Amino acid sequence: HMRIVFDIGGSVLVPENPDIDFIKEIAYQLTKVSEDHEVAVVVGGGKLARKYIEVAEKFNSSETFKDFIGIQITRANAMLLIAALREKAYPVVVEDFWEAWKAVQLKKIPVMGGTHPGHTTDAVAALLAEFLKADLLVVITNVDGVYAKKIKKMKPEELLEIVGKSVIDPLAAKIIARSGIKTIVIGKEDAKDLFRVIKGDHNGTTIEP
């Protein structure tokens, strides 16, 4: 079997408000996938995070404190997934990697939010995939993949170039490259059938050495 880390974008889980249908589905699918593989999840902030961050900006708070606000929101979102995962999820929002590790040992799905200023949840999932020696890293974002056109197959090296030229955070790309983490970038559409997405059946981007 495989150890997989799923990075679910905030805008996808919370486009405006929480997308209940999508949460119901992604939760069910994650459960099925965990029947055969070891699963771990990291959730983003989305619209809600940007609203609270914007409020802090009006009070001219530091950029660091804004990140801390964005982080607290992501943990709020993660709780919605943990709820949706029922008895299969780890009860608390995992805040560090070894904790996610403990959940895996207990056969429970750990759900993380952000962890530190300066990063995005993409960076968290990448570092999580690297810490867990995960076999696969699935990034579900707001776009079909890595684009004028769409690149289907590429390597970490090629990924750092595009990032330097949205989609995926630079720190996340550095981590995916330094470790050579097989990563898959798909949109909300392919995420409607994860079970097959991990089988290579998807219309996204596959980044691997």
Query: What does the binding site for a second copy look like in residue numbers (CB under 8 A)?
Result: 17-18, 20, 23-24, 27, 48, 51-52, 55-56, 58-65, 68-69, 72-73, 75-76, 79-80, 82-84, 86, 91-92, 97-98, 101-102, 105-106, 108, 115-119, 123, 127, 130-131, 133, 164, 170-171, 174-175, 178-179
Contact between 39 and 30 (Cβ < 8 Å): yes
Nearest to 145 by CA among 155, 157, 137, 153: 153
Nearest to 54 by CA among 209, 45, 92: 45
115-139 burial code (b ≥16 CB/10 A, e <16): beeebbbbbbbbbbbbbbebbbbbb
Shortest distance in whole angstroms from residue 147 CB to a second copy: 22
Q: Tell me whether residue 27 or residue 186 sits nearer to a second copy (CB atom).
A: 27
Shortest distance in whole angstroms from residue 132 CB to a second copy: 8
Shortest distance in whole angstroms from residue 69 CB to a second copy: 5
Q: And the tokens for 33?
A: 């996938």
Q: Tell me whether residue 18 or residue 145 sits nearer to a second copy (CB atom).
A: 18
